[PDB]
Amino acid sequence: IVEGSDAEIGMSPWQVMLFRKSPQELLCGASLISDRWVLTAAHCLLYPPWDKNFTENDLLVRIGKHSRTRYERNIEKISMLEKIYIHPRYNWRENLDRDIALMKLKKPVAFSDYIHPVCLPDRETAASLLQAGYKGRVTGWGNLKETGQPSVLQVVNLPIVERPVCKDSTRIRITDNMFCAGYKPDEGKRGDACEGDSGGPFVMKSPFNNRWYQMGIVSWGEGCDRDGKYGFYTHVFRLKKWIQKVIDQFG
Amino acid sequence: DFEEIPEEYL
Amino acid sequence: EADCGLRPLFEKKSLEDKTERELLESYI
Numbered sequence: 001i002v003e004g005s006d007a008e009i010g011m012s013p014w015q016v017m018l019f020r021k022s023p024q025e026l027l028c029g030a031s032l033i034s035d036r037w038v039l040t041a042a043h044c045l046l047y048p049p050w051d052k053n054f055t056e057n058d059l060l061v062r063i064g065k066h067s068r069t070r071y072e073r074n075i076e077k078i079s080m081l082e083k084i085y086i087h088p089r090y091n092w093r094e095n096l097d098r099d100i101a102l103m104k105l106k107k108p109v110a111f112s113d114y115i116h117p118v119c120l121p122d123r124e125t126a127a128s129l130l131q132a133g134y135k136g137r138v139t140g141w142g143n144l145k146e147t148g149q150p151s152v153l154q155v156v157n158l159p160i161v162e163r164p165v166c167k168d169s170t171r172i173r174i175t176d177n178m179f180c181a182g183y184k185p186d187e188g189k190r191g192d193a194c195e196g197d198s199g200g201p202f203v204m205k206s207p208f209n210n211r212w213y214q215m216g217i218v219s220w221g222e223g224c225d226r227d228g229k230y231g232f233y234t235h236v237f238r239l240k241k242w243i244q245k246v247i248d249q250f251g
Numbered sequence: 252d253f254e255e256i257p258e259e260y261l
Numbered sequence: 262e263a264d265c266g267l268r269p270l271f272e273k274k275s276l277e278d279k280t281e282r283e284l285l286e287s288y289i
């Protein structure tokens with residue numbers, strides 16, 4: 001996260017860290033949506049151009065964390081993966097369209113003050129909140145600059161940007177399964193996700209029921225916090241039919 | 252710079 | 262989900278985090 005600040009303890013209890021076993025390192029962020037399911041970006045697991053194709057045994061899920069590198073004894077919970085599900089139409093060949101994947105944990109994690117699931121949006125909430133100008137929040141342990149890494153979870157609040165502006169900022173073909181966010185270069189404020197933040201949540205707080213909903217997944221961007229550029233996020237509601245299908249078909 | 256995690260999870 | 266999106270250390274205790282007002286203030 002570039003130009004964000006340290007998160008408060010318990011601020012994003014659904015934040016998950018995707019951790020590689022060998023070598024031990026941070027791969028991506030993710031989110032807890034139930035006691036047994038984790039949501040992340042498909043590119044975190046599969047990206048053939050860079051020969052990346054991680055399976056269940058290559059990873060560990062770390063929940064309830066605040067510090068990036070420290071083993072938070074008695075606080076975080078580490079889980080093994082039972083099964084990974086990548087969207088069948090994930091487009092890694094062209095523009096990362098449908099960049100989403102679900103991960104089924106081996107056994108349910110117990111919730112606590114630091115571990116709690118985020119809500120997936122319904123049509124009405126998505127309709128009312130996903131509007132240009134409205135702000136959402138992104139969190140993660142990714143780079144602080146395009147160019148080190150933070151000691152603790154970072155947070156930044158960014159406004160959703162108008163589709164035409166998103167479209168006109170890149171040569172890449174943008175689809176209905178993506179949305180972009182960030183400040184325009186003339187707005188004064190700045191901030192953005194960066195390497196390592198991918199797969200993490202873009203959340204919004206509903207002013208109707210006071211709950212946090214995950215509207216997007218950190219997907220891609222050109223550099224980090226570059227002027228006239230914006231962060232791209234997977235549109236979670238548009239892909240909700242697939243999420244629901246996988247969950248009731250697999251557990 | 253990641254701290255050693257319990258061998259039981261590997 | 263049933264209890265989803267209500268943070269133990271914040272919403273459940275009626276405590277606000279330091280920048281959430283920024284989000285709520287943008288929902289015009």
Ligand SMILES: *[C@](O)(Cc1ccc(C(=N)N)cc1)C(=O)O
Nearest residue numbers: 194195196197198220221224231
């Ligand atoms: C991610 O961090 C990929 C990624 C995503 C978004 C941005 C951005 N500037 N918003 C940069 C990089 C990863 O795969 O590690």
